[PDB]
Amino acid sequence: KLGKLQYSLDYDFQNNQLLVGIIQAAELPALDMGGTSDPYVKVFLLPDKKKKFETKVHRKTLNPVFNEQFTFKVPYSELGGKTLVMAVYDFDRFSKHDIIGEFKVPMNTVDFGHVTEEWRDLQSA
Secondary structure, three states, rough: OOOOOEEEEEEEEOOOEEEEEEEEOOOOOOOOOOOOEEEOOOOOOEEOOOOOOOOOOOOOOOOOEEEEEEEEEHHHHHHHEEEEEEEEEEEOOOOOEEEEEEEEEEEEHHHOOOOEEEEEEEEOO
């Protein structure tokens, strides 16, 4: 039971930009003492992997609402072969951050006709 993530996708054909909205997460597991976590979401495209975005950290909550959006420059002919990675991490001051759960979206599964808004269950990373 690794919780769930709500996101959105849209593609800007004019500028060849993928718009990824990180809306919120729910029912996240507690990684810290005191029954909480400090979730933030790392977002990037495979196989590229260098261009990364991170939401703000939302401290001591298992149900963070992020309302953020990131844009990736992706030439359309390259798009179908990409995989969107959205990884929920636990923020921690004193050690390497652990992943709470993550979800991957193959871009060839997406109807890029209109804007799309989805819930997905997180998977172990």
